[PDB]
Amino acid sequence: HRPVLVLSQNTKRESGRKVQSGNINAAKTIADIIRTCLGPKSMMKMLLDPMGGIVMTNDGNAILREIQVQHPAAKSMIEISRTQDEEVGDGTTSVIILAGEMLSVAEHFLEQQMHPTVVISAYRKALDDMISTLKKISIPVDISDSDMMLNIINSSITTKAISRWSSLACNIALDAVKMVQFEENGRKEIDIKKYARVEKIPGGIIEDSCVLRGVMINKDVTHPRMRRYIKNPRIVLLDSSLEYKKGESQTDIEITREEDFTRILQMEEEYIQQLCEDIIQLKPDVVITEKGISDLAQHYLMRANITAIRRVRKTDNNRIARACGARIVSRPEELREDDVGTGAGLLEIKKIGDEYFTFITDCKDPKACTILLRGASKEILSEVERNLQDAMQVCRNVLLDPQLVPGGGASEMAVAHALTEKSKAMTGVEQWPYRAVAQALEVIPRTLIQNCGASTIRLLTSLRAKHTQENCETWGVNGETGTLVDMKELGIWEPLAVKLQTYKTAVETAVLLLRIDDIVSGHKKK
């Protein structure tokens, strides 16, 4: 069997029109999947996992992460929605539809024997003019007002499944960000993932869900003699163990006398009592560590009236350190008065469904909170958890950038008329791809009427005529009824960081996928 004299074995080669017009159809295919998940009249999409679980959601990020594609240009669009999920909260489904439409009009110019670098150079000139249009139609926000911030977060959850419990979910997501807004040195930061833990418990009703003023964990007391209800405890956080372990050496003891073996067993008990005497000098009430607690340490804390928790997680210790103001120490003989968690409120070991939960609530000024979610099952509680993550991040963008853009179609039509009037002074071959960017922005008011069943001809002709005048400029599409209502009366407002990240990512997705004229597949790596 002689081998065949080939070059680049077991790989593919593809170039020409089949790659330029092939990556457009892969981008149009993903945009048609989540096209029914943009307006407030959207529907859930039940997904099936390879682990056996079920993800029933309508968010554009959680749908595309559960789809395994084989096309290379289809893998690029999934990473676009992952970028929009980490930057902003409710900036997911809008970018995938917009990048599919900007590539839909880009396929028309590739058939006209136009080079792809001419369309990208017209896309970059159009991208620089969409940023300047949103900054002119913006509005400053009073972040100190409570009722003004409730209208911003209600506009982001009207699409999601928590729009029915809108009066409760807006107060939970607003109080969650304002508690974790911590500033130690001269730098403001909001960490809503490491400190704003969203725990879900199956059972109860959704109306009883509330954000606790403190933290909670699923841990029982180490001994039944310990108190399960302390009014004002002095919580001391530990990191090392309260046991006797082997040192980091090759220690070996030669036992030749009779009194030597009983002495080592007594020195193990005196070493635990020494570190237990060093933690009671500050008179604490609650001792919380991350490693195990031996029964010799449980005895000395029992008669000293100390409630001890055994195996609290490391991420939960960092969260309770911000709520109670304690210091996570790793040495019991180096405890100080500043390391004691004073100011903590009521501590209660409740039981929710045949399982104990340690509640540390009612704090004075906590820097970390825990949202207690209670619902029917774990299926719908994963929906409220994914919606509150999209509700707390849209409040983080206003506190770092208090500017609002009129959403609901009014944002896209205010720039599409600005790109049309600015295209009259182009006078070149880049004028016609510059006009297609303004026509590609029409897919966002197209989607709001296709989801509610309204007409797309009689409405878009009247909506385009409303932006011919420079006075109003804020007329959008009402997804509830289906008519044209001004967004100053409805209250649908989106933040500036959401609309800027939507336009910057949808253009650069079309920049990357238009410079691809060749695809090589079939090689291996290390």
Binding site: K45, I206, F261, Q266, S377
Partner: protein
């Protein structure tokens, strides 16, 4: 489809296709689980792959131990899991509401209407159903005769009414002597032991504790009266140092000196126990029982047997919580502060062997606040009938004590709630008029299934029940013996308030979310 283009091995369901998948699967779980609602339901024999018999008819055990692979059946099984986790009963009636909230909605969605219009009518019907439930609840100040009829309703629907007269005295009298003065009753204080001694109708209520392990020494006393409980957590068996040390000896005479010295720290723990027996005026019988959660070597068992101390070993984690309340002592973790204040007291401590398996009994306590239901079922599958019915009955009386009001029985709630939605049906003033009608007809499946399992007519029974409710003010219900409309508040058929409140909330949200699903697909490969 778009999913077929990206992934060729990914199935999908479209808008009119995924609705027929979820509704027809909800009728599959409805037609199976409707044969066990109420006392007239039939027993289901569930055989696994090994061959063991699981004879039960609870709605949570039926959905978990069923060979079904469907995404719609996995959603209802998760809602049914939380119904049997926080409040016990209400699992069979949970699935039948979801089976009718999707079947009555299919009559309107297939006839031109949109699924979101039906879900807007469910929220407006849930608001009236929640306000009507607070008007029909009866506060009876948690009387001990009221809790019998609450426990009798939950126990009949799981047994053939000969053990329901025995288990009601074992559930009500167990839940009263746990906590007082408006304290939340912990269900971990009740131990459930499975025996095989006499028969299924012999389950008694032990006032103390029943431990499943006996004495591990043949010279110990089997029956001990007027005992002292010493609850320990120390390890009496031989343990070494944490650092690897070993021994080193020169002669053979120094070899036996090290074996005597290595047990000195062990015997110092035993000498603290035998000196406590001499300080409690041991000029009488004066029995001593050490439960001793950690293991004991046979060297210390031989030392305690010569003094007359019964010593058990390898107890549970919650045995140091239940026996501490029952005996009144202190569960110690060391022998440095031994005193008679930490000792317990029981009038009778005896054991019994059932096929080379001893069972330690502790009885005759003053105020135990911890009991043990001693289930003595003949077969292995009959033990699963009583255990799943005791925890169904213990969680029923626990909710009736915590909540201050009692909700009426079989048809006294569901028929009166459906008639309240008819008079408030033109109050929505919009397209959601048919959504309140689909919610009111879905609540009527509870008198329909109970009239069907009892052998009576389905439509002829619902006419006479709704006639007695419209022509009177009494909440009339279903009678599973004669078929005539009888009031449930007078015959002694009650229900829990938190069960009917969550049945209007967990079933409604899971029905409005399923009706808004149109893209059932399987991707990820």
């Amino acid at each position: 489809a778009a999913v077929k283009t990206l992934n060729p091995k990914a199935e999908v369901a479209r808008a009119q296709a995924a609705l027929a998948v979820n509704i027809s699967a909800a009728r599959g779980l409805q037609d199976v689980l409707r044969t066990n609602l109420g006392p007239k339901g039939t027993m289901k024999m569930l055989v696994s792959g090994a061959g063991d018999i699981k004879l039960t008819k609870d709605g949570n055990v039926l959905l978990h131990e069923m060979q079904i692979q469907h995404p719609t059946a996995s959603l209802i099984a998760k809602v049914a899991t939380a119904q049997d986790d926080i409040t016990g009963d209400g699992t069979t009636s949970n699935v039948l509401i979801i089976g009718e909230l999707l079947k009555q909605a299919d009559l309107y969605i297939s006839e031109g209407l949109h699924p979101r219009i039906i879900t807007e009518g469910f929220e407006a019907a849930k608001e009236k159903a929640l306000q009507f439930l607070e008007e029909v609840k009866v506060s009876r100040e948690m009387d001990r005769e009221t809790l019998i009829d609450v426990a009798r309703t939950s126990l009949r629907t799981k047994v053939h009414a000969e053990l329901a007269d025995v288990l009601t005295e074992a559930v009500v009298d167990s839940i009263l002597a746990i906590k007082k003065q408006d304290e939340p009753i912990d269900l971990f204080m009740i131990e459930i032991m499975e025996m095989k001694h006499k028969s299924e109708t012999d389950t008694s209520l032990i006032r103390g504790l029943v431990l499943d392990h006996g004495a591990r020494h043949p010279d110990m006393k089997k029956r001990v009266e007027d005992a002292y409980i010493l609850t320990c957590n120390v390890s009496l068996e031989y343990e070494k140092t944490e650092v690897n040390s070993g021994f080193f000896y020169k002669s053979a005479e120094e070899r036996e000196k090290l074996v005597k010295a290595e047990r000195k720290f062990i015997e110092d723990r035993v000498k603290k126990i035998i000196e406590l027996k001499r300080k409690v005026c041991g000029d009488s019988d004066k029995g001593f029982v050490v439960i001793n959660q950690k293991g004991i070597d046979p060297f210390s068992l031989d030392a305690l047997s010569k003094e007359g101390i019964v010593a058990l070993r390898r107890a549970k984690r919650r045995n140091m919580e239940r026996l501490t309340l029952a005996c009144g002592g202190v569960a110690l973790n060391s022998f440095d502060d031994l005193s008679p204040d930490c000792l317990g007291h029981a009038g009778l401590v005896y054991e019994y062997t059932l096929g080379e398996e001893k069972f330690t009994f502790i009885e005759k306590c003053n105020n135990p606040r911890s009991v043990t239901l001693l289930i003595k079922g003949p077969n292995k599958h009959t033990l699963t009938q009583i255990k799943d019915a005791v925890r169904d009955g213990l969680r029923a009386v626990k909710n009736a004590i915590d909540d201050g009001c009692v909700v009426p029985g079989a048809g006294a709630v569901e028929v009166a709630m459906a008639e309240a939605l008819i008079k408030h049906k033109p109050s929505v003033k919009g397209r959601a008029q048919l959504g309140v009608q689909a919610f009111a007809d879905a609540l009527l499946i509870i008198p329909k299934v109970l009239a069907q399992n009892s052998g009576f007519d389905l439509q002829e029974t619902l006419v006479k029940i709704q006639a007695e409710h419209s022509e009177s003010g009494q909440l009339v219900g279903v009678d599973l013996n004669t078929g005539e409309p009888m009031v449930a508040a007078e015959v002694g058929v009650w229900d829990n308030y938190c069960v009917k409140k969550q049945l209007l909330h967990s079933c409604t949200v899971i029905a409005t979310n399923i009706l808004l699903v149109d893209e059932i697909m399987r991707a990820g490969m």
